[PDB]
Amino acid sequence: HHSGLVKMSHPSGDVEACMVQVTCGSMTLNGLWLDNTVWCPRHVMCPADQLSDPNYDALLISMTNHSFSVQKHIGAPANLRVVGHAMQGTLLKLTVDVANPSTPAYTFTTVKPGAAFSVLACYNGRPTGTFTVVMRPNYTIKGSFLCGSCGSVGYTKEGSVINFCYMHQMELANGTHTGSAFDGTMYGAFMDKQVHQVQLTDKYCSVNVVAWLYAAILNGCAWFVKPNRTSVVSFNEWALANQFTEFVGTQSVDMLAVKTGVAIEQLLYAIQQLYTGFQGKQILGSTMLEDEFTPEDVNMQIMGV
Amino acid sequence: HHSGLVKMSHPSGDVEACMVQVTCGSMTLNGLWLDNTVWCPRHVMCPADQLSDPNYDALLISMTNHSFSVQKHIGAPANLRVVGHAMQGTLLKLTVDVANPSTPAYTFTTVKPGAAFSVLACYNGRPTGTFTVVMRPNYTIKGSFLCGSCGSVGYTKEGSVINFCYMHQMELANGTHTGSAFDGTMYGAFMDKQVHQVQLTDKYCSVNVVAWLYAAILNGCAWFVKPNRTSVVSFNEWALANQFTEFVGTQSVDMLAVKTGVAIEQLLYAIQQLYTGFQGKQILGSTMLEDEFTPEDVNMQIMGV
Numbered sequence: 250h251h252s253g254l255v256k257m258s259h260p261s262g263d264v265e266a267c268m269v270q271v272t273c274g275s276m277t278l279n280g281l282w283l284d285n286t287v288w289c290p291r292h293v294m295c296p297a298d299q300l301s302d303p304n305y306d307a308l309l310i311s312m313t314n315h316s317f318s319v320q321k322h323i324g325a326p327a328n329l330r331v332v333g334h335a336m337q338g339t340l341l342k343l344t345v346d347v348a349n350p351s352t353p354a355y356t357f358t359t360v361k362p363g364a365a366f367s368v369l370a371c372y373n374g375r376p377t378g379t380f381t382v383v384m385r386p387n388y389t390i391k392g393s394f395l396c397g398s399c400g401s402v403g404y405t406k407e408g409s410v411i412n413f414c415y416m417h418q419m420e421l422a423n424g425t426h427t428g429s430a431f432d433g434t435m436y437g438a439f440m441d442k443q444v445h446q447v448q449l450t451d452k453y454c455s456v457n458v459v460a461w462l463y464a465a466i467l468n469g470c471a472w473f474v475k476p477n478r479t480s481v482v483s484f485n486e487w488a489l490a491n492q493f494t495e496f497v498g499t500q501s502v503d504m505l506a507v508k509t510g511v512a513i514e515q516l517l518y519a520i521q522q523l524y525t526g527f528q529g530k531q532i533l534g535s536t537m538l539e540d541e542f543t544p545e546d547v548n549m550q551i552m553g554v
Numbered sequence: 555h556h557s558g559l560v561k562m563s564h565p566s567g568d569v570e571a572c573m574v575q576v577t578c579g580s581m582t583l584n585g586l587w588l589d590n591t592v593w594c595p596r597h598v599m600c601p602a603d604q605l606s607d608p609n610y611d612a613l614l615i616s617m618t619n620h621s622f623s624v625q626k627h628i629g630a631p632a633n634l635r636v637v638g639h640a641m642q643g644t645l646l647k648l649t650v651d652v653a654n655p656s657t658p659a660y661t662f663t664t665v666k667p668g669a670a671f672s673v674l675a676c677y678n679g680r681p682t683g684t685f686t687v688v689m690r691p692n693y694t695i696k697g698s699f700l701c702g703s704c705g706s707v708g709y710t711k712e713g714s715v716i717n718f719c720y721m722h723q724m725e726l727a728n729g730t731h732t733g734s735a736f737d738g739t740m741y742g743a744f745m746d747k748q749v750h751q752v753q754l755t756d757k758y759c760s761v762n763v764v765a766w767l768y769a770a771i772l773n774g775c776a777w778f779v780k781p782n783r784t785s786v787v788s789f790n791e792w793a794l795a796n797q798f799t800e801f802v803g804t805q806s807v808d809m810l811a812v813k814t815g816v817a818i819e820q821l822l823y824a825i826q827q828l829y830t831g832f833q834g835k836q837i838l839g840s841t842m843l844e845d846e847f848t849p850e851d852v853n854m855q856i857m858g859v
């Protein structure tokens with residue numbers, strides 16, 4: 250049996266039309282062209298052989314507008330003249346003299362741990378792939394990024410409005426990734442430097458595990474459901490000692506409880522038992538808990554909400 | 555540790571610009587507009603209450619050109635006048651009086667079991683999501699499709715050329731999906747009818763399992779590698795008795811063997827042992843074999859080829 254769940258990304262066309270290549274000195278990466286502004290990671294200013302631990306304030310002072318070259322490649326090829334530049338946090342804000350005629354309706358938002366978003370991976374200003382990730386509790390993502398991918402963007406969509414939430418910056422030693430929000434802050438405690446940094450400990454996202462167990466029930470797989478219940482308060486105390494996030498319910502989870510007739514508290518109890526072992530049984534083809542699907546994923550993909 | 559593998563789809567913009575809505579009678583679904591042709595599933599001709607087991611030859615005779623309404627919604631809204639119609643296998647070929655000005659360079663191809671492709675899921679001629687799947691050995695895909703999704707398309711890309719390989723038709727009782735190639739044939743032994751159909755038995759895709767074990771080695775995870783080797787001939791005999799596809803090597807797998815220094819035959823032996831059980835150990839976070847990543851995925855995402 251197949252659960253009917255896949256890793257679903259938004260269609261990428263609207264964002265593809267905003268990607269550009271930004272070159273400065275010996276560095277080239279990707280940027281996002283919206284209206285008369287191009288956003289890109291500030292380490293484009295760094296000499297390619299001094300990425301270890303840069304002094305970005307001094308680099309910024311050394312640049313002028315024609316220190317930067319902005320090129321759009323696909324769709325409508327163009328060189329975009331830079332007429333202003335500024336730094337906000339770990340991003341550069343370049344002002345260009347042409348407004349992107351394909352600028353979508355958009356906002357900037359910050360994504361929260363456990364929430365999903367779509368990524369458009371780009372190299373040299375050319376989109377190459379798209380994938381979806383959940384923001385981990387330790388403010389990394391389990392992505393797929395190589396050299397040249399910085400400036401690739403992550404986003405969600407509400408209606409036709411694109412909510413940009415992530416601009417790629419770096420890989421960590423354990424193979425995970427992190428980046429900036431468009432307010433210029435890095436997610437988590439990370440800084441845009443290549444030297445050793447403490448990494449926070451990851452955790453299972455409890456609300457997503459609950460969503461996945463509801464997905465199992467909706468597929469006729471409920472062997473783990475018992476009358477036994479664990480309160481949210483009691484579960485959250487247990488979670489703190491067992492590398493789980495605390496559970497915070499939402500309307501999306503409530504809709505799953507109503508559809509299946511299985512209470513949240515029954516699945517909180519199930520999680521505590523399953524964490525100790527599946528005892529040879531599988532759930533939706535798996536012998537470990539799955540936290541990479543959201544309640545919204547389950548509502549949309551299975552219940553067609 | 556994260557392997558650096560995600561489910562990677564192609565950027566969807568070029569295909570989004572080809573999607574249209576096709577209406578006929580009481581049915582509406584999606585179609586693909588290339589040049590002066592619109593492709594769509596033939597069951598658009600079926601009255602919505604007679605999808606059980608249609609006589610499509612009789613339905614086709616009963617239609618005329620203005621039995622069909624073709625509408626493009628996003629980007630460049632339009633009603634496309636139908637000036638011809640024909641049936642090929644399980645698809646309709648509608649001729650319209652306007653050439654799609656956004657027609658990409660394209661081909662039609664058939665995808666083979668174990669190979670990956672990208673899907674653009676659409677409803678009412680509007681793209682809603684994108685995801686990637688491997689064609690299963692029993693000629694189903696483990697997708698995410700709801701009512702209204704037929705006519706959604708699957709494709710691969712070589713350079714800028716889009717190779718269309720799949721047009722969605724139906725869901726099976728076990729939750730998997732299947733569809734047509736653009737020559738009009740259904741994948742596998744399936745027919746575009748809603749009544750009971752024998753489903754062929756699925757299998758592990760051995761070449762993809764080998765790719766995944768190489769991905770593990772490339773991430774420093776090689777506890778399952780031993781000097782022991784199983785020949786391709788011997789493995790393929792074993793596979794026939796154990797619900798594995800026969801292994802057929804490719805240049806992409808050879809590149810992984812060269813990079814890691816681990817021979818294909820060492821991993822064929824490992825698979826035979828792992829199939830019997832992982833004995834409490836994990837590989838790239840998993841306690842079962844993974845066959846949803848291709849050798850090309852591993853080369854591109856990890857080795858940057």
Ligand SMILES: *[C@H](O)[C@H](C[C@@H]1CCNC1=O)NC(=O)[C@H](CC(C)C)NC(=O)OC[C@H]1CC(=O)N(C[C@@H]2C[C@@H]3C=C[C@H]2C3)C1
Pocket residue numbers: 278292300301394395396397398399400418419420421422423426440441442443444445446
């Ligand atoms: C931007 O294109 C690029 C994206 C990277 C390339 C590889 N995959 C990606 O996602 N970003 C960088 O190269 C970035 C630049 C700095 C922020 C200025 N640096 C980066 O990602 O470094 C790669 C890491 C690999 C690794 O193990 N570390 C951790 C270091 C090594 C040593 C142990 C811990 C610290 C010190 C750096």
Ligand SMILES: *[C@H](O)[C@H](C[C@@H]1CCNC1=O)NC(=O)[C@H](CC(C)C)NC(=O)OC[C@H]1CC(=O)N(C[C@@H]2C[C@@H]3C=C[C@H]2C3)C1
Pocket residue numbers: 583597605606699700701702703704705723724725726727728731745746747748749750751
């Ligand atoms: C086209 O939009 C649509 C896509 C479907 C809807 C649900 N998810 C999808 O992928 N295709 C159809 O509705 C399709 C139409 C026929 C090909 C004319 N029929 C279809 O997909 O039927 C849904 C299946 C669910 C199910 O269990 N079966 C198997 C039947 C039921 C009974 C046991 C086995 C046979 C007889 C049909």
